[PDB]
């Protein structure tokens, strides 16, 4: 029978982008103010730094653009184990669908290397790098961005919001769904999309 | 109205991969035999080198894996001008949909840089890197590979074969279509998929 196809974005779902940004920002710019994760709002971290102090958007971006930023990101709790299990379920195909952002020098490569490091070489085959997720056909999309963007107005996938510091204050209106973490019942969400 | 979505793979369609491989192979390994383009058959160039002489698959692959292989590829005749025009047509969205192959170190980055070089920064937004094109939804796919591969048995796009040295000897059975080059009537092919 037809496999359930699930898209999972790495950023803020598998790899701890927010923790990495904060940790490296503080170490490189110890005499500047920063944004504690609890105070993060909106997926655009650099823009919020810019509102904190003129010039900090540029510094935050320079952190994310630096070599090894993506590669040294820590996996989120229970992320690697859940996705490995997910991919092992019958009638389930998992693709990692994630953005190069506008940082083409190191980001694409390190994302591949990160996935290989935690998931193995085999899994590299399932990666789709795109700014626009709406052109990718699937049953479910799990990512940390509350807003959908891209060329297809109504994507084929249901969008499920993975909780992150910057989105946790949003109270989603049904039938919009939230996955609180990888300890949460993700199997139930998948099962709901099966025949 | 709904835009016609066309996927175009860079390799052998916009960027002259075969010429680049042959040119750099010959310069680096001047005392080895090589495969003239007219003798190329099948998209897997390294495998054909391996059949020519044991060990040459590895050397050919080392050429493609080298820094600057992808970035220094020459654009195919009329490619940049056609795709720029195509993207400028009304009710037409063009995405470049292309593979990282198993060469993650330089290939992804140089493909982005190549597109930026010939098409501009704006166009980077339209790039989808994937091994599996069948999970990308679209009306048309133009690439140089005669065989479809990927998780979706029947993709949404019609596959149009762009002529390359390795595929030109294949006589396609209708209704399968071929675009002989960018001087050929590509507008007619697009128009056929419009309302």
Beta content of chain A: 5-15%
Q: Sheet bearing the most strands of chain A, described?
A: 6 strands, parallel
Put simply, the count of helices of chain A is 6
Q: How many beta-strand elements of chain A? A: 6
CATH superfamily of the largest domain in chain A: HAD superfamily/HAD-like
Specify the CATH class of the largest domain in chain A: Alpha Beta
This entry's quaternary arrangement is homodimer
CATH topology value of the largest domain in chain A: Rossmann fold
Order of helices and strands of chain A: EHHHHEHEEEEH
Total tally of structural domains of chain A: 2
Structural class of chain A: alpha/beta
Radius of gyration of chain A: 17 Å
Helical residue percent band of chain A? 25-40%
- Give the end-to-end Cα distance of chain A, rounded to a whole number of Å: 10 Å
Largest interface: A-B, 30 and 30 residues
Architecture per CATH nomenclature, i.e. the level-2 architecture of the largest domain in chain A: 3-Layer(aba) Sandwich
| Spatial strand sequence of the major β-sheet of chain A | 3-2-1-4-5-6
Q: Rough shape of chain A?
A: globular
